Design a protein around this ligand. Structure first.
Ligand SMILES: *[C@@H]1O[C@H](CO)[C@@H](O)[C@H](O)[C@H]1NC(C)=O
Ligand SMILES: *[C@@H]1O[C@H](CO)[C@@H](O)[C@H](O)[C@H]1NC(C)=O
Ligand SMILES: *[C@@H]1O[C@H](CO)[C@@H](O)[C@H](O)[C@H]1NC(C)=O
Ligand SMILES: *[C@@H]1O[C@H](CO)[C@@H](O)[C@H](O)[C@H]1NC(C)=O
Ligand SMILES: *[C@@H]1O[C@H](CO)[C@@H](O)[C@H](O)[C@H]1NC(C)=O
Ligand SMILES: *[C@@H]1O[C@H](CO)[C@@H](O)[C@H](O)[C@H]1NC(C)=O
Ligand SMILES: *[C@@H]1O[C@H](CO)[C@@H](O)[C@H](O)[C@H]1NC(C)=O
Ligand SMILES: *[C@@H]1O[C@H](CO)[C@@H](O)[C@H](O)[C@H]1NC(C)=O
Ligand SMILES: *[C@@H]1O[C@H](CO)[C@@H](O)[C@H](O)[C@H]1NC(C)=O
Ligand SMILES: *[C@@H]1O[C@H](CO)[C@@H](O)[C@H](O)[C@H]1NC(C)=O
Ligand SMILES: *[C@@H]1O[C@H](CO)[C@@H](O)[C@H](O)[C@H]1NC(C)=O
Ligand SMILES: *[C@@H]1O[C@H](CO)[C@@H](O)[C@H](O)[C@H]1NC(C)=O
Ligand SMILES: [Ca+2]
Ligand SMILES: [Ca+2]
Ligand SMILES: [Ca+2]
Ligand SMILES: [Ca+2]
Ligand SMILES: [Ca+2]
Ligand SMILES: [Ca+2]
Ligand SMILES: [Ca+2]
Ligand SMILES: [Ca+2]
Lengths: 387, 387, 387, 387
């Protein structure tokens, strides 16, 4: 049967560690892919990790980074959570350089985008069988979430972008049932920018928090019901969430302009009027990570908070991050559990190698006691191929 | 229960990409077999990839090619679709230097030929148990399809050749039920040549398109029902399909003599009077690939077509190609979906190495939007062992 | 259904060999983790081996041992009994630098401790889902059994320590049902020290034998029922069991002070008034192993035995050891079978390398004929990375 | 349910090839064990390959050959038929330097011998749980079949030897039900020698053909029913079967003395008064292999035969060989199908390396057409470690 998804997030007070795979440390000698943009998604029986490779093994001459990100070699695969991604324990999913995937309670759905920059085509697979395709409508790059899509009562939802990455673009919301596109509307948001949204279900609706890459240092959001009627805005707190960003000060609900261009993919959770914010420690480069709890952050513009918990120290590298949930059909509780993951990037451009890769850690929220520490990557660069 | 196979191919307008394994790029460092003649075949639950190895790993001293193609070391194996063929994730099938395999809805059937050139014997296995054998009837190299066999209502069909490869030969059609040969007739075709046929079922009958290696630059075909009553001919279009071939011009339905003394294994699909033709871009060497749609190509000798879609650019290497289908019991439609695969050869004789190998890509036909691009192999030769 | 565990240990006269994995000999060339503290635990269908890695493969530059034992990289994993632990056949369990795990007849329970030395937090997982946490109550290094926990009628029991490792500490006993902590009491034992206990069920109760690291060369024990009412003492035999230890002489039932101030994790079985003692052959370093049977050892202070059986010679290295049992639901008998395992340490500090690791052997007790021999590790040090 | 085994062998006229794994050719670069004495045994669902390793990978420094054959490192494992034995796809069975195993229709039974030369103890496992042990009764090297044991109606049978290998010894037959020894008698055979027997069931009884290592160049046999009432003799044909052996001449039914004092493990099948003999081509070293059919060979002393089929040429290395069968519950016939396997030894003492290993091929008998060829090993020695 299908995941009902008519429950609310249940209260938490801290986060406990869930997994850590040690990809690069193992990949120094063993056979490990070169990956980027990992993410985690859970069925009603297990949880898996998805990632995007370019066909190259760490510490090999084919890992020379002159291949473009949108190259005809990248693929989407998956391995059980907490394991080093190698060609001997991974499953093939689709051919893509931008992707997402979610499970509706019966079978896996995957979305994968490939093709030239003016004609990219998204291929939708349901249970390993091609079912539908979507073609770019504004002829720039068609890109998608890079994290899990959200399923409620058998239908699964996602958001797509197509247009300039430093100006006004075009935005759409898709509703998918059994691998077939059933309905879609396009957002009417002048002066907003949405990229790489991370969506979660809550009380029968969907909420997504995205990345503003044009003139914003705080984050935008969008929420809609199963009939696609949406609402838009920005997070009104004074604890800015993007990267780069100014210092903490007086926030605002319309785009914040200071240090706005560029960003990193991120997330947040809504609890009434409060908000849990996850952001990097450094205001100019991708270093560190922490979790903040501002009890009036969704609607008030002050810069005062209540609880902070450390995840990675400010001297170590981090990257993308996103959210995922565990349904009651899996965990046996009567509430939706929230979790999240982080990606730790090593290599170019901040270090002197020829490659670039990432590993992951992930946490899940609880109500009992917790502690704050630092769980960095720990690889010792440069490798043999670099010398 | 068994696959009924009493339905027709359903309409398509383009092809979408399905898989890509990146064999050689990974095999530069990891442990990957040296393979040739890959092909794909699907059961009622999954799809697998079959291939022929010589017992050697890539980038090793045993990969030197002083070994004949018909050697006592080659074997047939299989791995899940879209994965690099390695000894740690492959299944053993049979000992052979020429093979084919299909699934009837209950268990796998495999055919494998081994032995000397004047006494080769084909061993038939059903569910991993030897059941029957066929011995050469003209004491010359015995050979078979090199792609999937076609099953309708439980019975499975295949075509075999035995005789000279530059003159008149002897041809047979076999009907197999549960690994036992039930009926066989030999074709009466003077001035025809059939090798490496690729067969698919359509509306309760079988249609095969083969390779003419004696004096033909276009392709022959044969169709028969479940009682083995056949019909023969050539494709009457003016868009020649073999390789090497002359320039496009006025075609014919009897062997085209110009440039017709060698070839490459290929395929085609029939839609009423039209035809989908898949052929290499270069007229003299194995470079490129494309798909053509000639609405009157099965019976008219005119060189005008309607739609072309690119698969690999003319500057990159390609090779064999064939067809396979996905039954309604697997995909849930009311069709018989068509698909195809391509092999990309790297190494001797066109390059300066000591080995030769191939990887694969595959596509499946749809009715929504698609795009044309190039998905080449991408390995950087020569390897370490060559230096 | 759940393991009843209301039966007694059945009589034995000797031990037969059960498994041997050859970790280091294989790891000289292949890809094998660097592990320590292995242990074995059995469900109602199979038996598995758990271990703690630091994220590094054997014979690699990341195996350089300047990483602390309590580091943010260690993880808990498991592989089938008798196999070399490699990243291609292991399952991820939890992130920890101190752990234990047992199976209640329905699903696996794992406990893992991570965090700083003054705030360590234990995360309890039941069937792969986080359920509860325990935080340190005296702000010193928190630590647990390092071997299997004991389950009787669905409930599972374990013992934890928190405080100085050369003085008085604080001790607790926990009762867990379906991953939730239900009851706990703290031991009142002045002048006792308990670390790394190895517990087994017997006739509906629990008995644990632990390691005294403050002033003891013989071992302490504790026994309790399902309502947590405990009894404490020391093993009253004159065959001392710890390491380092004095020569055999007149034993005591309260701490023996001579050569007491250190130890190694060990075990013992109780049979009425007798006892089976497993200890190293050398009295000052970890070399050798043997099994002793003293028919009045649990309550009498003489030093006279009846049977000795050799496991490893005195010239070879050994280490930790512990106990586990096989329930009637698994083995089909009418009695609880006892078994044990041993760890063989190679590398620093007794040898000139840069790493340290261990492999394992294990035995199970029978009633028929047996033999004594030596089954050492057998690796030839130093490795290539050391040169 | 259990294998009934009340059927007779069904008629055959030739042998068809079944599997070939290519162990050494792959092991030149990949990770492959160093094995000896492989054998094949089939359940009611599949067939597996068992072998004895010493803990070392091919092409590694631990593969030196100063370790004795009876060493504390050897183990018994198994992998699916037709695959290269590697630590990433093998199952652990038992710790032994002499072994056998058979399947009764419900679970696997394995026998493994380990220990010193005057106290070796055999450990019997049924479904992975230790059940019984047998200890040496004459304090000399205890040894067993090295191939599959034979099961009829829920009981499984085997033969064991203990005593000198160049003189009179002591012989026993064991009957095992569910891993427990139920009955045993010792053979009364003056002037006979039995080692490494290969047994198969036929019409409700058991027949074994063994190796005479004291003064025999032809082979002995023994047959018994389910109550252990035996009959003894020698094969009365003039086509000698051992190795070394004299030239073909007039045979005898009592020990043949010429060139008798050594041998190699072998097999034979009985058909009324005929016999199928499998022997090496060279009369002094282990080179080649062939199958002979002497229609009166079981009772007559002439040297004339009818059919010969080649398996390996006389210029290539071979070794041990044995027999196994496929029950009607597996194959679906009304027979008991016969098959066999061969081992191909490479390395010391006939070649200049530091190691020794073997790969395998296997054949199964049919009634249709067949061919004779040569399927040798094909590795190119010496390896890198030898240089
Ligand atoms: C939600 O739906 C489920 C199944 O339909 C039902 O059991 C549950 O009580 C509903 N109520 C909530 C939690 O909103
Ligand atoms: C990476 O590629 C550049 C050329 O594009 C080349 O000069 C450089 O040597 C390469 N590095 C390696 C290790 O191949
Ligand atoms: C949920 O799905 C069921 C079955 O399609 C449908 O009847 C129902 O209207 C849907 N809505 C909810 C949330 O009940
Ligand atoms: C094939 O036969 C089956 C069985 O009657 C039928 O259900 C199916 O519709 C037929 N398909 C076609 C399209 O003829
Ligand atoms: C390949 O084989 C040829 C012919 O035997 C030999 O001369 C050459 O050295 C071989 N190359 C390698 C790398 O072994
Ligand atoms: C399919 O085969 C079965 C078995 O021979 C037969 O009974 C059935 O009639 C066949 N169906 C058709 C339409 O031929
Ligand atoms: C253990 O308890 C079960 C019932 O749970 C009972 O049937 C069994 O006989 C008891 N065994 C012993 C040895 O007490
Ligand atoms: C091991 O670590 C020490 C301390 O940093 C370092 O000096 C030494 O060079 C390292 N050895 C190796 C093999 O890396
Ligand atoms: C075992 O536990 C169950 C509760 O799950 C209880 O009902 C039963 O009485 C217990 N058995 C004994 C003998 O304590
Ligand atoms: C073997 O025994 C079974 C009953 O166990 C019987 O049905 C079968 O016919 C017998 N077969 C032969 C060949 O004796
Ligand atoms: C093999 O063993 C011998 C005897 O110890 C030794 O002298 C020789 O060096 C070894 N060879 C290798 C490659 O280790
Ligand atoms: C096979 O064994 C079963 C169990 O002993 C027995 O009942 C049956 O009679 C045996 N069959 C024959 C034919 O011996
Ligand atoms: Ca921004
Ligand atoms: Ca606030
Ligand atoms: Ca041609
Ligand atoms: Ca035309
Ligand atoms: Ca002590
Ligand atoms: Ca005593
Ligand atoms: Ca002899
Ligand atoms: Ca004769």
């Amino acid at each position: 049967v299908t995941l009902a998804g008519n429950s609310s997030l249940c209260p938490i007070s801290g986060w406990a560690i869930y997994s850590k795979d040690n990809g690069i440390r193992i990949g120094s000698k063993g056979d490990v892919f070169v990956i980027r943009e990992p993410f985690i998604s859970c069925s009603h029986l297990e949880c898996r990790t998805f990632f995007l490779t370019q066909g190259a093994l760490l510490n090999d001459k084919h890992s020379n980074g002159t291949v473009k990100d949108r190259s005809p070699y990248r693929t989407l695969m998956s391995c059980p959570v907490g394991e080093a991604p190698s060609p001997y324990n991974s499953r093939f999913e689709s051919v893509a350089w931008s992707a997402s995937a979610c499970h509706d309670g019966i079978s896996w759905l995957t979305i994968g985008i490939s093709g030239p920059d003016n004609g990219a085509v998204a291929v939708l697979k349901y249970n390993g069988i091609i079912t539908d395709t979507i073609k770019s409508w504004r002829n720039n790059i068609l890109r998608t979430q890079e994290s899990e899509c959200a399923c409620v009562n058998g239908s699964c939802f996602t958001v797509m972008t197509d247009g300039p990455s430093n100006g006004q673009a075009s935005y759409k919301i898709f509703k998918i049932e059994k691998g077939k596109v059933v309905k879609s509307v396009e957002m009417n948001a002048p002066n907003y920018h949405y990229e790489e949204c991370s969506c979660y279900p809550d009380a029968g609706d969907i909420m997504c928090v995205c990345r503003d890459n044009w003139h914003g240092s705080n984050r935008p959001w969008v929420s809609f019901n199963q009939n696609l009627e949406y609402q838009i805005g920005y997070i009104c707190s004074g604890i800015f969430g993007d990267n780069p960003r100014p210092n903490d000060g007086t926030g605002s609900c319309s785009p914040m302009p200071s240090n706005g261009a560029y960003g990193v993919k991120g997330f947040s959770f809504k609890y009434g009027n409060g908000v849990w914010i996850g952001r990097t420690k450094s205001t100019s480069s991708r270093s560190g990570f922490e979790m903040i709890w501002d009890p009036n952050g969704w609607t008030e513009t002050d810069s005062s908070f209540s609880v902070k918990q450390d995840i990675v120290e400010i001297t170590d590298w981090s990257g993308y991050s996103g959210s995922f949930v565990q349904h009651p059909e899996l965990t046996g509780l009567d509430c939706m559990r929230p979790c999240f993951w982080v990606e730790l990037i090593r290599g170019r451009p901040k270090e002197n190698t020829i490659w670039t890769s990432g590993s992951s850690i992930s946490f899940c929220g609880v109500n009992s006691d917790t502690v704050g520490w630092s769980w960095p990557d720990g690889a010792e660069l440069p490798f043999t191929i670099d010398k």
